[PDB]
Amino acid sequence: HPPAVYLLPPAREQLNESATVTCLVKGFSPADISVQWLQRGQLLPQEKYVTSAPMPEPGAPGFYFTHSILTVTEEEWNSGETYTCVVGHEALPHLVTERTVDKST
Amino acid sequence: KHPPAVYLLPPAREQLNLRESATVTCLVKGFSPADISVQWLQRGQLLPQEKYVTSAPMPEPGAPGFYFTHSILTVTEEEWNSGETYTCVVGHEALPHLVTERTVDKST
């Protein structure tokens, strides 16, 4: 069962500071999964994001769930650049699925 | 018609370790019809929309005719650790009392 990926932008709240971009990954098994992030199609280094170890998905026995949370500056977020959450998983025929967001999202 | 089930997830320990932000997640599942409000209350007050992020409802993969959504609230790790409470507020017409709430804090 491949992961479903939902990528949420930071809150609209006008930042003066860090912006948080949130990648929710659910409905997958086995628990083995990879998550990386892009800015403008380029790999961001690990230090900018944190990915939770997969845990059993609440409300879905047999499946797991992880969050990956990217921190960027308000300026980096408000530049209008595209951010991509890239998820690798063995159930995907093309091995990977991704989502993208940007300040307009 | 079927009322939502609500699961309020505290921030992952891996995030809190960084001593920066804390992301609280409200997962809302198994409801019908699709129409729903999912929202946050902090310090006894409903937060303005620009302070959180809520997705439009989506079809539940396994359950044709049922929907789900999620909402997230991101605060500082210090605030979270200080014992602040966070309440997910969910409005749906299948709920007898119309609105249901869940609260989380550091203790759980």
Phi and psi at residue A74, to the nearest 5°: -55, -35
Pick the CATH number of B1-108 from 3.60.15.10, 3.55.10.10, 2.60.40.10, 3.40.30.10: 2.60.40.10
Searching chain A, which residue's CA lies closest to the CA of residue B53?
A: A11
Judged by CB atoms closer than 8 Å, whether chains meet at A52 and B15 is answered as yes
Judged by CB atoms closer than 8 Å, whether chains meet at A67 and B5 is answered as no
A27 touches chain B (CB under 8 A): yes
Structure resolution, Å: 2.0
Q: Which of A20, A52, A58 lies at the smallest CB-CB distance from B74?
A: A20
Task: Report the SS3 class of residue A64.
Answer: strand
Q: Which of A6, A12, A20 lies at the smallest CB-CB distance from B23?
A: A20
Task: Report the SS3 class of residue B11.
Answer: coil
How far apart (Å, rounded) are the C-alpha atoms in residues B38 and A30?
30
B25 touches chain A (CB under 8 A): yes
- Report how far apart, in Å, the C-alpha atoms of B107 and of each of A59, B11, B94 are: 22, 12, 31
Helix (H) or strand (E) holding B16, with range, is helix B13-16
Best CA proximity match to A89, nearest among A30, A38, A22: A30
- Report how far apart, in Å, the C-alpha atoms of A99 and of each of A21, A86, A102, A105, B59 are: 12, 7, 11, 12, 18
CATH of domain A1-105: 2.60.40.10
Q: Which amino acid type is present at position A43?
A: L
DSSP-assigned letters across all residues of B28-82: EEEEBSS--EEEEEETTEEPPGGG-EEPPPEE-TTSTT-EEEEEEEEEEHHHHHT
Searching chain B, which residue's CA lies closest to the CA of residue A58?
A: B7
